[PDB]
From a paper:
DEC-205 (CD205), a member of the macrophage mannose receptor protein family, is the prototypic endocytic receptor of dendritic cells, whose ligands include phosphorothioated cytosine–guanosine oligonucleotides, a motif often seen in bacterial or viral DNA. The MR protein family is characterized by a conserved domain architecture that comprises an N-terminal cysteine-rich (CysR) domain, a fibronectin type II (FNII) domain, and 8 or 10 contiguous C-type lectin-like domains (CTLDs). Here, DEC-205 is thought to function as a promiscuous endocytic receptor that captures a diverse repertoire of foreign and self-antigens and internalize them for antigen processing and cross-presentation. Namely, DEC-205, PLA2R, and the avian IgY receptor FcRY are all reported to exist in a compact conformation at low pH and transition to an extended state under basic conditions, although the mechanism of such rearrangements are unknown.
Building on this finding, we observed a large change in the elution profile of DEC-205 at pH 8.0, eluting with a mass four times that of the monomer, suggesting that in basic conditions DEC-205 formed a stable tetramer. We next performed cryo-EM analysis on the DEC-205 tetramer in basic conditions (pH 8.0). Here, the DEC-205 tetramer formed a 115 × 200 × 100 Å toroid shaped particle with a large central cavity and was ultimately resolved to 4.9 Å. The overall architecture of the DEC-205 tetramer revealed a major rearrangement of the second CTLD ring that enabled four protomers to assemble into a prolate toroid with clear D2 symmetry in the 2D class averages and final reconstruction. In contrast to the structural conservation of the first ring, the C-terminus underwent a dramatic rearrangement to form a tail–tail interaction along the median of the toroid. Within this extended confirmation, CTLD8 from one protomer contacted CTLD4 of the opposing protomer and vice versa. The cryo-EM reconstruction was unambiguous for the placement of the 10 (CysR to CTLD8) domains except for CTLD5. Here, the cryo-EM reconstruction suggests that CTLD5 is highly mobile within the tetramer, and the domain could act as an allosteric center for DEC-205’s pH-dependent rearrangements. As observed in the DEC-205 monomer, CTLD9 and 10 were absent from the final reconstruction, solidifying the notion that they are a highly dynamic part of the protein. Broadly the BSA of the protomer 1 and 2 head–head interaction accounted for ∼2300 Å2, whereas the protomer 1 and 3 tail—tail interaction was ∼1500 Å.
Numbering used by the authors:
A (entry chain D): 30 to 156, 164 to 211, 231 to 341, 358 to 390, 392 to 488, 508 to 625, 643 to 689
B (entry chain C): 30 to 156, 164 to 211, 231 to 341
The structure:
């Protein structure tokens, strides 16, 4: 789950935490959470639960006093987090002078939470037509921060306006077909992620047919089918297979321009129309050796046939005594992209996917292991109605499209965390910059694989990662960084529209909106996680190499000796490594 | 109006302007606008109209050469504005060394427009179901920046995608009830302000009694009734008086929360609902 929880702010150097008094701040008297409680509220404000008094900055005299103020007034109260500190009104830090907190704008002060390493700002703010609540709110002459339970309503109830005394518009504390609750699809997604659930994922036709006859449901709502990843066609909220679609025949379904990038479900007839879901609308969220060319991968073998024939002839030919290609993991896509003779950039490949019943419901020709769907962004190419369906590999990435399969083309068929060769481990928290491992990337498919793994792990925004790209010379050259001794040339670069804005530093990697790009930030102190891949007298020599050697055995010696520290003993005579030409 | 007009970038200290050659930049030979033409295009990019060869930065060696590149490639090309200068890839200024433009990231350089004190960057970028055009575009094996006329279409026609050769979806160069043209109300407003016009302002009932009977018009469209100023209730695009209103009885018309902050017209009965005007939907601008 992801919700706001009460906490306490403590100083790092001195064991003092914030304690409020009638109009000011007093000494610690800490380690007792019976009175000292703080929380984050809207407009980036800090709120005390018990005292019901918030802090602010009143810049009116020469020395701005840091006293208590009412949360409903023109006090201009808000606070933000710098790399290891707190800044308020205008670069004003909550400086401590052994008992009282003032604003002197000093760069030497740290603030953490209770008994744990955290910048107390990694968790963002969390929260009448199902509108989000407004925290805090003044009711019955007292301030309140949470949807409390009373004897008036059934359960928890909150306010949907900044001033409930003048508007008198309440709402239900939403912690499921919420009819007559028109919200944005992004707002619905962030609210349902606040509750820890995910959007509706339709896997079989039974659930859809059950939802058709439902009375207490809106005729128009969202399902969650959207492309958060700009390099793939269509996905769900979670990682569910794409085998059941209910697209619409009326609209031409423009891929990216002309149409939109969202789906809307019509239940009166069961269609999925392309549209923009930025407006308000109801929703709902719940070591085999193989024979002569066939490359083996975990028991089975794959091989591409060099014949160019139609879909039916390919379905009849090697189903040879063989079966068509079946993707069930991530390594098989690598096997397909690495082979196929430079992928034949301008060409297509076949793959067998069948569907006879209406609406479209894809099933595997041999098996039912539909786990990975890798479609082009964004050409689903789902026709109106057709009994023969077909799927084709396009592009160097190996994306899935739906051609007409009326021409002659080649195909591939088969015969009888971790990735397959290396592991990938991620930690819980990483405040410094790469103190244990440094991830290095060399190819694009590895970027796609790590992005898929991060999408399977990460589920929300406001997250960052680390990639081995930095520079310490502060000159302007960027290359693949390491722990020292890296001189390889950058072969691939996927930047944003205008990503590089600093002549140095360490880059980051976000998965919120522009997923899969190398975001750039400063490298002074930036908390972000990272994933890691897991003869005069007594002389013997020979001029056969134009060099006089001196080696020893492994038994007559005192201790085992090697060429490592030889520079400490032989360099006095101008000696070096074993020089063979 | 507000549109991207052809111009030339000049240097402040000495009288030098950019002149593109087969793969580089050479001395000024300026004061002649027969070949030296430059324009701003999407992704914050600079395009030369005659040579049809854009500039970029290829950081692959120790000293990244500033040469010409194909505008359809992975070159990482874009330029932005600093207070009195221009920075490209990463704090890389277009340094001038008396004849050629390079990238040394020097903080002593100034660029302006031809014969006018201007930062050449105060004017932002300007521009199939009436979607905005994509400039430039490669057609017939050559680059094009403006909606040019031909013998196929009636007038100007542009491309509505990044690669017209693979998608094949064009549109009319929209310089008026555009039916089947679903755009966002904000996008519609900025597009009709690019054209120099403003949104529809209903002043008398005669305009409404003329529009309700109109055949060639969508059943739903935008008029422009919105509050761009957060301290006042409802206004139009221009400064027109608020005397004629056509509000709705069905919806409770929530002021700010519960409803939204845009107006949505229904022409079947002439009604104004409260709604969110961020989605794609037809409109009209006078």
């Amino acid at each position: 789950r992801a919700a706001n929880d009460p906490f306490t702010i403590v100083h790092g150097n001195t064991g003092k935490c914030i304690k409020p008094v009638y109009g000011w701040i007093v000494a610690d008297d800490c380690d007792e959470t019976e009175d000292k409680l703080w929380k984050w509220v809207s407009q980036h404000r800090l709120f005390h639960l018990h005292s019901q008094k918030c802090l602010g900055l009143d810049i009116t005299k020469s020395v701005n006093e840091l006293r208590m103020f009412s949360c409903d007034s023109s006090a201009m109260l808000w606070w933000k987090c710098e790399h290891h500190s707190l800044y308020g009104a205008a670069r004003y830090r909550l400086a401590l002078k052994d008992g009282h907190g003032t604003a002197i704008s000093n760069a030497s002060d740290v603030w953490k939470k209770g008994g744990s390493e955290e910048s107390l700002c990694d968790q963002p703010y969390h929260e009448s037509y199902g509108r989000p609540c407004e925290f805090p709110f003044l009711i019955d002459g007292t301030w309140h921060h949470d949807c409390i339970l009373d004897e008036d309503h059934s359960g928890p109830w909150c306010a949907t306006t900044l001033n409930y005394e003048y508007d008198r518009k309440w709402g239900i504390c939403l912690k499921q077909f919420n009819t007559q609750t028109a919200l944005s699809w992004k707002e619905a997604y962030v609210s349902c992620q606040n509750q820890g659930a995910d959007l509706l994922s339709i896997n079989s036709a039974a659930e859809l047919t059950y939802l058709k006859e439902k009375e207490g449901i809106a005729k128009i709502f969202w399902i969650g089918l959207n492309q958060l990843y700009s390099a793939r066609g269509w996905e769900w909220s979670d990682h569910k297979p794409l085998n059941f679609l209910n697209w619409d025949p009326d609209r031409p379904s423009a891929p990216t321009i002309g149409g939109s990038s969202c789906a809307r479900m019509d239940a009166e007839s069961g269609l999925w129309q392309s549209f923009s879901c930025e407006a308000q609308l109801p929703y709902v969220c719940r070591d085999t050796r193989c024979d002569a060319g066939w490359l083996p991968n975990n028991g089975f073998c794959y091989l591409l046939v060099n014949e160019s024939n139609s879909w039916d002839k390919a379905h009849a030919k090697c189903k040879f005594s063989s079966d068509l290609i079946s993707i069930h993991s991530l390594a098989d896509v690598e096997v397909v992209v690495t082979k196929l003779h430079n992928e034949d950039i301008k060409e297509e490949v076949w793959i067998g996917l069948k569907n006879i019943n209406i609406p479209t419901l894809f099933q595997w020709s041999d098996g039912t292991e539909v786990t990975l769907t890798y479609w082009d962004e964004n050409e689903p190419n789902v026709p109106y109605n057709k009994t023969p369906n077909c799927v084709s590999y396009l592009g160097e990435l190996g994306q899935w499209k739906v051609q007409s399969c009326e021409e002659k083309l080649k195909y591939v068929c088969k015969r009888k965390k971790r990735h397959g060769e290396t592991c990938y481990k991620i930690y819980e928290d990483e405040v410094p910059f790469g103190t244990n491992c440094n991830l290095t990337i060399t190819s694009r498919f590895e970027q796609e694989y790590l992005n898929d793994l991060m999408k399977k792990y990460d589920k929300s925004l406001r997250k960052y990662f680390w990639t081995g790209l930095r520079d310490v010379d502060s000159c302007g050259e960027y290359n693949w960084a390491t722990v020292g001794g890296r001189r390889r040339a950058v072969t691939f670069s996927n930047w944003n529209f205008l990503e590089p804005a600093s002549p140095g530093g360490c880059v980051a990697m976000s998965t919120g909106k522009s997923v899969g790009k190398w975001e750039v930030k400063d490298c002074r102190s930036f908390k972000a996680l990272s994933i890691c891949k897991k003869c005069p007298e007594g002389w013997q020599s020979f001029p056969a190499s134009l060099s006089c050697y001196k080696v020893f055995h492994a038994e007559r010696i005192v201790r085992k000796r090697n060429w490592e520290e030889a520079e400490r003993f032989c360099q006095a005579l101008g000696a070096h490594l074993s020089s063979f030409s």
